[PDB]
Symmetry: C2
Subunit: 279 residues, 2 copies
């Protein structure tokens, strides 16, 4: 397991991902940003917390509940640098798969050790040298420690052949992370969260991306149009509002024979040209 600074060259990170199958990018995000995501999620769910004396929505997509998530986190250059080099040559485009809140409650037992691509039926056609089917970025809000259940990884196990037994608990390496660090988790890396034996939640959240030709865990078609229009064009494509280009330049997710973003009406020249009557 490698812990690398934010300014590590991209080729070195992909090199380590190839060799060991995982790594941690310290200071992946500033503590400011990860805390803002948690704050915006709290403001969305609005769970009732009783005062000391007598005197709400269910959680949805992180891109819906958190403006910071859909405007800053999903534009993270480290996410797209790794995703472009991981899926690009084989699949062309990639897009957002799913993003979860990873809050470990005090007293929760150890998580089963698993690969994230296990629910892909086609993980049985893939060989360990092929590109991964998905990649997770797990960002710490609280500290990730041994006691509070920080994620454990088994380096090298991404090259294990298909059907290889799950790794042994003794050979699971805990990931120790400060707020803002991120654990890089390809879909083939064997991992699991540990037991939280402390009196406080282990907090954090994740993004994940996978090839454009695979159906994402989450749809974002229920999001209001005002949120979709404040997204960058890159994030609009990530969240399923734009046509995708395969490796062979065949298009999927099209609106008829044209692009989806054209049929839905999803400003550029007006901002650039001062003489545009909409500037």
């Amino acid at each position: 397991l490698h812990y690398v600074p934010y300014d590590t060259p991209v080729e070195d990170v992909m090199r380590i991902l190839k060799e060991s199958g995982t790594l941690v990018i310290r200071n992946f995000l500033d503590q400011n940003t990860v805390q803002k995501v948690q704050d915006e999620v709290d403001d969305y769910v609005r769970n009732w917390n009783p005062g000391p004396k007598y005197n709400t929505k269910q959680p949805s997509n992180l891109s819906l509940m958190s403006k910071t998530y859909r405007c800053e986190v999903l534009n993270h250059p480290w996410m797209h640098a790794i995703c472009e080099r991981m899926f690009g040559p084989t699949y062309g485009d990639y897009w957002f798969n799913g993003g979860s809140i990873l809050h470990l409650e005090p007293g929760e037992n150890t998580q089963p050790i698993h690969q994230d691509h296990v629910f892909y039926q086609i993980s049985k056609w893939r060989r360990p040298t092929d590109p991964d089917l998905t990649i997770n970025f797990t960002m710490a809000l609280t500290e990730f420690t041994v006691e509070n259940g920080g994620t454990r990884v088994c380096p090298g196990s991404h090259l294990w052949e298909n059907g290889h037994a799950s790794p042994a608990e003794e050979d699971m390496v805990p990931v120790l992370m400060q707020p803002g660090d991120a654990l890089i988790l390809p879909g083939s890396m064997w991992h699991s969260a540990g037991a939280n034996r402390t009196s406080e939640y282990r907090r954090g959240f994740a993004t994940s991306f996978h090839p454009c030709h695979f159906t994402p865990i989450e749809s974002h078609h229920h999001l209001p149009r005002e949120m979709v229009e404040e997204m960058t064009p890159l994030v609009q494509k990530m969240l399923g509002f734009r046509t995708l280009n395969l490796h062979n330049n065949v298009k999927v997710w099209k609106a008829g024979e044209g692009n989806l973003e054209d049929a839905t009406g999803l400003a550029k020249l007006a901002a650039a040209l001062e003489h545009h009557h909409h500037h």
Copy 2:
């Protein structure tokens, strides 16, 4: 293996047996003449994107019991849910030359990983609007070529078997079946149109999120799932295409037909 012409009332397991053995077949009178006429008229008034252009396509054709019976047995065991992939008008003008012989699943990067004994990546239903004759460019198939290993060379032009269809007949084209349109050496256009379906875990060629809400509410729940408006269930009870943790159709506010007090 050979090309088979079977009637509408053929039992399903025979159709699947023929599909496994020969990789293709024709179901006669797949549509009646009314549907053949109605879809032609609706497209003309609008003039792919067939669900948007033809009310008969999205309300009746996409509910076709043969499509769902075949798709259930082809994709159900391995992937669970399936949904709409793409669909286009197949219009052949006089003088058009022969189409390159191809497999439809060729554009899936994961066709390289698949074995011929695995389930198909996609299936096409090519329905004739005009007659399909050998001289007007009727589709040609190569029965048994779906079982060739990947990277196998294309069939020779002489190994291709033309398909003959009256208006309303349908050719069933798994993604592994080598096929091509012929040259239209007649004086009248050869017309058809297609539906296609593929596993729920694969991204469709065509999105339908640009369709109007009132249009989507005309659809059946089944067709709503076909066209990307409902959460999909995998073979292993895992869900994809979900809204947060709930179903997409609940989050959009998409029983009511069964109970009159609803």
